[PDB]
Amino acid sequence: AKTYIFGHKNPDTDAISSAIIMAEFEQLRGNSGAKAYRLGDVSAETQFALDTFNVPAPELLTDDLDGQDVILVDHNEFQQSSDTIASATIKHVIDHHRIANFETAGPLCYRAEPVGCTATILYKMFRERGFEIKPEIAGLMLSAIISDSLLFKSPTCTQQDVKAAEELKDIAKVDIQKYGLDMLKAGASTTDKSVEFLLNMDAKSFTMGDYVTRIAQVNAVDLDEVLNRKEDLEKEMLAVSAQEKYDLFVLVVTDIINSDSKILVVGAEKDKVGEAFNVQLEDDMAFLSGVVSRKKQIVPQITEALTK
Amino acid sequence: AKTYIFGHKNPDTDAISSAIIMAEFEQLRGNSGAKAYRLGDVSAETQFALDTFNVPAPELLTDDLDGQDVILVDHNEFQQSSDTIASATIKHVIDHHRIANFETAGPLCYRAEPVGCTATILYKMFRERGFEIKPEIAGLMLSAIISDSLLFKSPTCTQQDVKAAEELKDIAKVDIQKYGLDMLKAGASTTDKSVEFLLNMDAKSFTMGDYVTRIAQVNAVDLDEVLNRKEDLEKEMLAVSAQEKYDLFVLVVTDIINSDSKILVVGAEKDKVGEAFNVQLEDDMAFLSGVVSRKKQIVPQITEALTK
Numbered sequence: 214a215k216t217y218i219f220g221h222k223n224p225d226t227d228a229i230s231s232a233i234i235m236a237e238f239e240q241l242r243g244n245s246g247a248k249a250y251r252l253g254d255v256s257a258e259t260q261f262a263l264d265t266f267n268v269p270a271p272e273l274l275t276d277d278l279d280g281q282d283v284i285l286v287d288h289n290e291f292q293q294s295s296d297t298i299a300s301a302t303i304k305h306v307i308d309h310h311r312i313a314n315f316e317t318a319g320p321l322c323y324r325a326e327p328v329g330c331t332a333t334i335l336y337k338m339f340r341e342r343g344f345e346i347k348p349e350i351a352g353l354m355l356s357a358i359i360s361d362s363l364l365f366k367s368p369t370c371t372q373q374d375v376k377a378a379e380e381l382k383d384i385a386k387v388d389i390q391k392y393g394l395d396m397l398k399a400g401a402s403t404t405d406k407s408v409e410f411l412l413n414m415d416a417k418s419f420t421m422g423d424y425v426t427r428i429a430q431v432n433a434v435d436l437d438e439v440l441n442r443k444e445d446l447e448k449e450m451l452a453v454s455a456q457e458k459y460d461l462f463v464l465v466v467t468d469i470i471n472s473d474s475k476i477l478v479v480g481a482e483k484d485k486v487g488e489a490f491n492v493q494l495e496d497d498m499a500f501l502s503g504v505v506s507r508k509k510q511i512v513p514q515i516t517e518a519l520t521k
Numbered sequence: 522a523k524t525y526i527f528g529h530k531n532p533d534t535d536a537i538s539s540a541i542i543m544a545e546f547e548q549l550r551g552n553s554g555a556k557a558y559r560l561g562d563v564s565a566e567t568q569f570a571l572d573t574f575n576v577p578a579p580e581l582l583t584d585d586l587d588g589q590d591v592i593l594v595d596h597n598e599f600q601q602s603s604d605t606i607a608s609a610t611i612k613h614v615i616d617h618h619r620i621a622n623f624e625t626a627g628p629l630c631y632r633a634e635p636v637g638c639t640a641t642i643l644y645k646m647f648r649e650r651g652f653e654i655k656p657e658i659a660g661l662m663l664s665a666i667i668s669d670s671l672l673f674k675s676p677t678c679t680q681q682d683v684k685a686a687e688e689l690k691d692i693a694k695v696d697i698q699k700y701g702l703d704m705l706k707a708g709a710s711t712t713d714k715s716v717e718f719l720l721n722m723d724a725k726s727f728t729m730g731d732y733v734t735r736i737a738q739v740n741a742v743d744l745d746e747v748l749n750r751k752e753d754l755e756k757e758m759l760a761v762s763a764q765e766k767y768d769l770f771v772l773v774v775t776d777i778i779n780s781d782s783k784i785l786v787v788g789a790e791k792d793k794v795g796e797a798f799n800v801q802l803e804d805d806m807a808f809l810s811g812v813v814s815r816k817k818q819i820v821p822q823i824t825e826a827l828t829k
């Protein structure tokens with residue numbers, strides 16, 4: 214029996230790391246057929262982490278999952294998952310996100326916790342079972358936590374994430390702030406990249422009531438680096454929205470040095486979500502928010518605007 | 522800060538017990554606004570357990586859950602939950618079932634394990650946390666486990682359910698086989714009850730792909746006690762299917778002594794699910810299975826038939 218372990222499409226550092234980490238967990242637990250996979254490209258940020266701790270990228274999933282045992286990490290929504298996910302047998306989910314568009318035939322292990330990072334939950338699982346946390350594995354856990362939490366500044370970050378990171382740094386042999394900022398910087402180069410690349414780099418679809426929304430995330434050293442390409446961005450966001458039948462396309466731009474975030478929003482349901490945010494720039498194509506609240510989570514806020 | 526804790530509509534013993542057990546857990550955890558509720562009638566089986574351990578029945582939920590904190594036990598599918606569940610904020614789910622028709626705006630705690638009973642999971646939460654298990658609480662846990670497992674003979678039963686029961690017996694101060702058989706017998710009187718009563722006693726709706734299916738469970742001393750009323754059963758099942766627009770209505774009849782089960786199946790997708798079982802008799806309106814495979818679970822097998 215093989216078991217396929219993977220994170221979401223357009224994987225982020227958490228998605229790649231958690232797949233490798235959970236494959237380790239399964240193997241230490243005695244499940245030798247467990248194997249990590251990815252559903253997309255390894256980003257520059259994630260490559261920095263993999264290179265630092267000398268871990269190879271997981272294999273790109275090309276197998277049909279029909280009748281196969283599957284473990285999902287860092288996602289549950291089927292449209293974020295493998296093309297053949299609906300034909301798989303999902304044994305286990307480990308995740309830190311909202312639940313939607315998820316259905317199984319029978320019972321399964323499902324573990325979600327409202328923490329800042331999937332690797333934090335996996336850290337706790339290793340702990341609970343008393344399994345070895347190798348230095349590389351600790352490095353990937355720490356990388357994931359720094360990535361998802363943005364060096365502990367995102368509204369999703371919790372003290373469990375901070376505590377896990379503090380306990381992992383000596384195992385990984387790494388200074389959190391120094392390594393962390395280097396890692397974040399390694400995925401923050403935008404000006405020489407195409408609009409198509411930026412909008413697909415870290416981008417996921419969401420099932421929100423009757424609607425399907427696309428959300429892309431871009432890190433930069435300066436918000437304006439990205440945001441004065443607004444016109445070209447909007448154009449591509451509208452084109453993709455039509456081609457994929459999205460009801461909404463949100464671009465979240467985040468300053469890694471500053472921790473400030475803004476959103477650029479396009480699509481059929483644009484005006485409805487605009488009411489939920491501080492609109493600073495608007496037109497027929499799009500709206501641009503002022504710098505977003507540090508404490509409120511964006512995904513739930515958008516969901517509530519579309520459903521409520 | 523209220524938090525409503527409840528099980529599914531037409532609650533079984535697991536659904537009633539687990540709500541009370543989880544309310545205790547929350548109070549014990551420090552959450553003082555936590556309260557147990559029920560969404561329907563207390564069955565004869567459940568009443569026997571409540572009387573044995575002097576636990577009153579939880580309050581019938583009548584409040585609108587709009588904007589309220591909720592914890593679900595022993596279910597997740599929205600059609601099985603409160604009428605206002607979509608307007609609530611689901612903080613926590615503890616369950617042992619398939620997942621479907623479940624969506625949240627934001628992150629949450631979700632704990633599902635593929636075990637025989639929700640109370641088994643709640644028991645593990647007490648053990649993990651080092652919480653004291655009162656003898657009344659231990660009795661409810663044990664009752665739920667005996668109920669869902671049918672005195673440890675159902676396909677869903679695991680060694681974790683057995684282990685937990687062995688340790689709970691001395692806390693509850695009860696003989697498992699003796700109390701268990703009494704409890705099961707108390708909910709197994711069928712010939713005196715109307716067809717309408719039997720089909721609404723332990724009946725839940727399910728989201729299975731494009732379909733909505735209704736499944737009713739009936740415990741009996743002897744399978745033929747119920748199944749000799751075949752035609753009266755079918756008639757009410759078709760009537761309800763038409764009136765509620767179900768694609769399928771399954772009646773599972775289980776012998777409490779030997780744990781043999783048979784299914785009586787009616788509705789639009791009847792032929793499609795008949796494919797997945799050993800059909801002992803059939804006509805235009807219904808099929809009746811032979812004694813169902815002792816290892817494989819019924820709900821997943823139905824779901825699989827309606828999809829693949």
Ligand SMILES: [Mn+2]
Pocket residue numbers: 220221224225226227228287
């Ligand atoms: Mn991710």
Ligand SMILES: [Mn+2]
Pocket residue numbers: 227228287309329330331361
């Ligand atoms: Mn993540």
Ligand SMILES: [Mn+2]
Pocket residue numbers: 528529532533534535536595
């Ligand atoms: Mn139940």
Ligand SMILES: [Mn+2]
Pocket residue numbers: 535536595617637638639669
């Ligand atoms: Mn149950």
